[PDB]
Amino acid sequence: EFSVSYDDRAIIINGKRKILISGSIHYPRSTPQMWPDLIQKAKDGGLDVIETYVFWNGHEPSPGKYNFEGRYDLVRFIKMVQRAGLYVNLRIGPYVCAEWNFGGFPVWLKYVPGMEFRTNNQPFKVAMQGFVQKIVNMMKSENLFESQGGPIIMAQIENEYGPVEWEIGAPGKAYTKWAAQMAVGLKTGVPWIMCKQEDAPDPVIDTCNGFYCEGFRPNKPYKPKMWTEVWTGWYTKFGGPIPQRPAEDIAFSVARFVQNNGSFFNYYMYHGGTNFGRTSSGLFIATSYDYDAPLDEYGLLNEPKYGHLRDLHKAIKLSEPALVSSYAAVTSLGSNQEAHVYRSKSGACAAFLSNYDSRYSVKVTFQNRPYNLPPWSISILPDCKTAVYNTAQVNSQSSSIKMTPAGGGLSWQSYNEETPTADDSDTLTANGLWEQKNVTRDSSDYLWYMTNVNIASNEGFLKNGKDPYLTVMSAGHVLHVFVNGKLSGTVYGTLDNPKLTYSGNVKLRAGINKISLLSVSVGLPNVGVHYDTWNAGVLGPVTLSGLNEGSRNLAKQKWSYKVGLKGESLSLHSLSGSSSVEWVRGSLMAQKQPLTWYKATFNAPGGNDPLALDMASMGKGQIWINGEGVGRHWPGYIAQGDCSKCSYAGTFNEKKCQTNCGQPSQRWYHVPRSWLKPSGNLLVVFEEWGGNPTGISLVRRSRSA
Template identity: 80%
Template sequence: MGTGASNWNALRGCSFFMFVFLVLASSLVCSVTASVSYDHKAITVNGQRRILISGSIHYPRSTPEMWPDLIQKAKDGGLDVIQTYVFWNGHEPSPGKYYFEDRYDLVKFIKLVQQAGLYVHLRIGPYVCAEWNFGGFPVWLKYVPGISFRTDNGPFKAAMQKFTEKIVGMMKSEKLFQTQGGPIILSQIENEYGPVEWEIGAPGKAYTKWAAEMAVGLGTGVPWIMCKQEDAPDPVIDTCNGFYCENFKPNKVTKPKMWTENWTGWYTEFGGAVPTRPAEDLAFSVARFIQNGGSFVNYYMYHGGTNFGRTAGGPFIATSYDYDAPLDEFGLPREPKWGHLRDLHKAIKLCEPALVSVDPTVSSLGSNQEAHVFKTASSCAAFLANYDTKYSVKVTFGNMQYDLPPWSISVLPDCKTAVYNTARVGAQSSQMKMTSVGAFSWQSYTEETASAYTDDTTTLDGLWEQINVTRDATDYLWYMTDVKIDPNEAFLKNGKNPLLTIFSAGHALHVFINGQLAGTVYGGLSNPKLTFRQNVKLIAGSNKISLLSVAVGLPNVGLHFETWNAGVLGPVTLQGLNAGTLDLSGWKWSYKVGLKGEGFNLHTASGSASVEWAEGSLLAQKQPLTWYKTSFNAPAGNDPLALDMGSMGKGQVWVNGRSIGRHWPAYIAHGSCGACNYAGTFDDKKCRTNCGEPSQRWYHVPRSWLNPTGNLLVVFEEWGGNPSGISLVRRTTGSVCADIFEGQPTLKNWRVISSGKVGSMQSKAHLWCPQGQKISQIKFASYGMPQGACGSFQEGSCHAHKSYDALERNCIGKQSCSVSVAPEVFGGDPCPTISKKLSVEAVCS
């Protein structure tokens, strides 16, 4: 027994040393292989060149409860990398006071990405633009003595370096860089600085050089990039941003061709139509970039999310930052964009061995057609492109013929089999609907119109710039003065009221005369300045002029935007008096920062309990400066929720004390809307929707912000809306569509051929409803030459009359179904000499 014990102890000792050896060996391997570098072809991760597909998800624009699902859907969509900015003003709201909790828990977000098996591209900036308030800069930075933003300026560089070091230090301490075993493979310093440098010259060049050296000196072990920065100093990689980047070349042949922002749509501004970008064009732009040697592409945005609170910049950027992204504002896949890109990513990954090995050989296939071929001894991939915006063509490549629709690229992973075409969408489309789950019973509280010379105001000579007074602690600043009118003024007798003229730097202005709203004016994104010019009713004696100036987000882009102004800067004049024109600009003005209701914290449970609220017949409706509150229970289920604010004017909304953002349904979208053709060069004015309607009607209410019962909803209304029209709605799938051509390239073709098995090469229409829903009705079905798009299909000149029968037989009562696009399915060929397709719309319930 003693001998056995001795042998066991010896064995245990050997096992221990073997364990230590394996751990050391493993750590040695990790230290050797955990590396990120680059060459002219691609980013290399652990010595392997990679084609990397990335997508932007900004952590503060969604909730921590949403993050895991967003990241998983990004992975399911074929992404390798999640890209995010770092938001300085969210993390350092006051000098030296840091915040990394809740929506700003950056470390948690990055670790969730790592748990999903994806990489991270961390854009530290710390200038971010991003249509974010003040471009991500904290407002206190503006008041650092001697500072000038984004130039060769000592105070700015010191503050920027301190914050950058703070973020890099956090990432290192949490071991989040790839060289430490973490997911971060790329970092970014500055952001789209090239145009600024070009304008300011030598100080800009010096700043660029300093920023690059400072960043590289932090020793992250991963490459740094600068976007839109043609002179990015080595070893920093310069990258491209835009709707298209196929012609971009980095400033050194030793650097890879990278696209940090492929704009999936565009942002919505209050007063602007809602931009959309067709899935076909977005896919075309990516395929065109890859066929020209690109190896890293990032979708900006992949999920846009919401500008909660007062985080929207611009000014005039809407609360929704949906961006027409593959995942919508609520985190649901936007179909067909999400699915069409997923299929593209699969096709590109099939080509990866060839793409990262050689540069393409380009040959002409016609007047507007090309072949880009990547061929090695062991692999071959080809991209066949048709740049014509009107006509489909049949091209010959490798002794085979291929049909290329207008403005499209086909992907051939083996230089033979077309598995994907950017203009042939195999993914289904979804028509989303907003369904009311109930209205509310409201109480109201009227905000007092502020007056000059009271205890809660500050009186100064002249007109002061708004942000210098508020420090952006609130959107609101009162400007107040009193005007005495002599009883002998002629206008009191003849009825010709004086003309009040007010010039403001923006962004909106409510003018009150003796406590009554005289009028409202506001600017827009292209010109935030405004002028109020109106005849006003004054009385003999003292008249109270109260101007409520409203900011709608601070600028996020532009040369030295920190110097841009807001508020009433004058002149303010009164014309039509016996003495002529009275200039009020230099008078004594009283100032009051914020609203009385803000001071009472009426948006919180405790604050709302501190005042008396009117209800029933006393409820204020269509009155300016009114607070409304109600209580509601959370609806059952997991469907995303929103508030329908279409009956309101302008203001802010809170749920359980948390701001869901600014509402402004009264700002009707201007511009040109109409038919949208995917073919041809896209820009942000193309394919717009919602003209003549509110720029934003629906406002996201995160599920995680709700309690099962007793949720407090508070609305502040500036203009005067009708709260009885507000309702809580669910966002669900109303119907799904497929629009599939005969012989359409599919990934299934590749699987059949590569497996060596015999299988059907027919195209199929795939339909599926979300979990808990089934196909209840075939709203439209046509095999032949149908016209239109999902939601507006119409039969064409060729139509198989058994189209509905085939779809109803295969799909009704099921969550999902597949139907082959072939004549025998629909009772025969309705037009044998013509290429046909199947269009179908099915209702989910």
């Protein structure tokens, strides 16, 4: 009664070939209070399927101790999709990439003896098989595979391993084969897929990711052609612009794929959402994962994209009897124009009329009728006669985004974070520089590396008008250099170049000088061959020049380590209270000072509409509401890029339609309404850089035509 199989044409569900429309919604990038609404909008937007990764590091924070509660309740999310009448593509991974912290891998996994990720390595295979088996058993135990009457019609193993395999050689080939066999061996009763994996072994279907995939062919003629990631935009990085992808180009790319025998395509992202807390975002990934998705970060319709793709879906559904009972037949119409025709013996006929010219409209004649094709567009004729839809003709109105201040003027108190020093009265001393992940195990973004330097009274710089020069090199990602308790300077990296060098004159004086380096990670790397081997933190070298001796390398002296902030140890973000402390209010309140905690109590704004905090007056740090981590803020990191105006027409790339250049890369921080109560809400901000909290406002989001 229930089965999933496939043939050369399509995935076959309960014995019927289907042209499946899918979108990605990542369950932990929204709240369970949002999920039913997002799913309903996806259903109303013409999706047949919801696609999600599974996020291992979220589900297994320490070995053998699992978390499937709150926004990590994977079972509940899938059951909501089932309820709405949609299928699921479960992308287990468990490497998932996804601009997600460490690619999804638990940081603890890295420190298992003998471990090597994403290769033919026994401890990795054991841990990966163990978690995949855990997920498969949990789905089975809830009857969630389609073969059981549930929604899951397919699962993905690994993610984009093909390029890695290719670079790492024979051990990559072995691990590929192993992974595919281990997955198929779990007997889910439904197909397995691998994206970007030309050599995926039968019975696994290899699939295509990208802005366009119309030229892609699966690795056997008896496998269907599937596009697992139709990129709907691109991610936002701290320091980068907000990338957009025009609806007309997306619609063209989808029509181009479908007209060429493609039978599954999935929008990545459909709802992008938010990297809440501090274990979600990947390296330098913004708290917003909006992605220019059909549903915006806050869950509102992104018009006109949402409606324009809804209308495309309607056309595809009208075409579907023809699509599933024939194969595409191409007739050339002109220099840059084609007809892709699906003509069934049943009499059903659907046609796609294309104009690949990126500059000019062209009139074609098809079956005796003229059809005007705007540049870079495809018309869909679900009966081979009536052009119900053209990918460049948008009948949805656009809606523009407003973030309007609500409430106004919170009453703040502040608390200044200690600058610690190498008091040899520290539980963490070592005679060298240790890598940050190793020391913190990613329990905090912050690690203090501290050392004392003795200056002789007879140093020449003390007589002459001069300061010596300190160089600190770090693997990244932000570094604050404190000398004798005072911030001397701050440097910070980029996604592509997280490494840092601080070099500057420092105000050392005679006698003992205290150097305290605060090293900060901003999410962990999530993509790249051997990315899990890359370092963070101050590994040096660290040198002082300009002394009577010459230069003094400090890398082998006693280093003292403090993991995390004092406010983190005192739980200042917490509703109970973060070890209390002397909060300051009114005139003496700390302002534009580094390492300052701020807190305010507030009533929830009115309305049903989404909320954010406007953090433009702030610098960098973390936000909590009622003890729950809203995410990192970094409004001080200005967007740089090329924000040239763009046309939908012609080949898209992720830099073609960038917006927000010269603004904070993220100014507004999403606050889920369900996290609030009517009154007595506690807002805690840790401000790492320096800010004026009086400028913080709650804002309400709306979009109108």
